[PDB]
Amino acid sequence: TKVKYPDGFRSWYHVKSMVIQPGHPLENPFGGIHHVYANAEAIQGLRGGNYPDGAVLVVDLFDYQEDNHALVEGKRKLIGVMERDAKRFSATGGWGYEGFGEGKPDKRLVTDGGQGCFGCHAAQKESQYVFSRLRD
Amino acid sequence: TKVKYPDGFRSWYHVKSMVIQPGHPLENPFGGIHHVYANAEAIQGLRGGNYPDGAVLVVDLFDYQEDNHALVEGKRKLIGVMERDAKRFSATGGWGYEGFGEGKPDKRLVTDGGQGCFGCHAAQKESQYVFSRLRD
Ligand code: HEC
Ligand code: HEC
Ligand SMILES: [Zn+2]
């Protein structure tokens, strides 16, 4: 019933990025430069296939610094993790939701079984609760 | 003596990202959100080894739109490509430098055999002409 730390996620397929700046409704706590990653099973889902159990999506959130008309990556703030298990995570739509502070396996963040995460992701029911779209 | 189009680069290792905003000295043509990718060979060099022949670094440059304090990736502007061949690219320090407009193999951007690219990358001679640092 716990989401595994997605060991090796930095070697996975980079789906997309986005910057959330001060003023954005999600600045707290989603502020920063984020990178979405997908394991092979998650790519099958993202391509328009179905998500197999064992699909993992990671959102990797960095602080950034302003550096002369450049936003430069600073320290990692956290990672968000969605792990597909249709039966074990059925209460949250077949994805298990976890956060790791600074991306550290020992800093698990979620305290409500992921109901808060799922509450926002539920808007994306028709893309199987995933916001990110595969781009070329 | 032409750099090959790096087919499949989107499936490679994501090294790092950066945003270059308007007013940056390199705004033309490096303005946008960029993602650096490395093939397996290039990872050896980034980890502290010698870059082997066949190492390829790609910088993938997107337009973005500031939409309510989110920077949102738009169309791809171009890719920059560095291809390691100590002998074939000896005039430019063993890297071949090329750009592909909109990331399309038929839109080559470099017109000076990469001397302009090399002129700036030469400052990084001590890190084998590569600016990007591997981060976890
Ligand atoms: C709305 C108020 C959200 C809440 C609460 C949570 N997330 Fe979410 N997440 C949200 C958006 C708008 C996006 C897309 C970002 C983009 O660049 O397009 C995401 C994305 C993720 C991802 C990546 C997969 C995807 O659905 O695109 C993961 C792995 C993820 N978020 C995890 C996650 C967790 C663990 C949360 C609770 C701790 C959480 N999110 C809440 C919107 C919102
Ligand atoms: C200085 C005036 C530059 C010129 C001219 C060119 N490049 Fe360069 N490039 C520059 C910097 C500061 C960076 C690092 C960006 C980052 O996020 O840290 C880069 C990076 C690249 C890369 C990625 C590999 C690396 O060295 O980090 C590639 C593949 C690359 N640049 C290609 C490229 C080409 C093809 C150029 C001539 C058309 C070229 N660059 C010019 C600085 C400068
Ligand atoms: Zn200025």
Numbering used by the authors:
A (entry chain A), B (entry chain B): 3 to 138
Paper passage:
Cytochromes c′ (cyts c′) are a group of putative NO-binding heme proteins that fall into two families: the well-characterized four alpha helix bundle fold (cyts c′-α) and an unrelated family with a large beta-sheet fold (cyts c′-β) resembling that of cytochromes P460. Of these, cytochrome P460 (cytP460) is a heme enzyme that oxidizes hydroxylamine to N2O as part of nitrification (1), whereas the evolutionarily related cytochrome c′-β (cyt c′-β) binds the diatomic gases, NO and CO (2). By contrast, our recent crystal structure of cyt c′-β from Methylococcus capsulatus (Bath) (McCP-β) reveals a hydrophobic distal pocket dominated by two Phe residues (F32 and F61), a structural feature we have named the “Phe cap. Proposed roles for cyt c′-β proteins include protection against NO stress generated during nitrification.
We further probed the roles of the distal Phe cap residues (Phe 61 and Phe 32) by comparing the properties of wt McCP-β with those of the F32V and F61V variants, focusing on NO and CO complexes. Our goal in characterizing these aromatic → aliphatic variants was twofold: (i) to provide further evidence that the Phe 32 aromatic quadrupole limits Fe(II)→XO(π∗) backbonding and (ii) to establish the extent to which the Phe 32 aromatic quadrupole influences heme–gas reactivity. We assessed the impact of the Phe 32 aromatic quadrupole on McCP-β heme–gas affinity by comparing the structural, spectroscopic, and kinetic properties of wt McCP-β with those of the F61V and F32V variants.
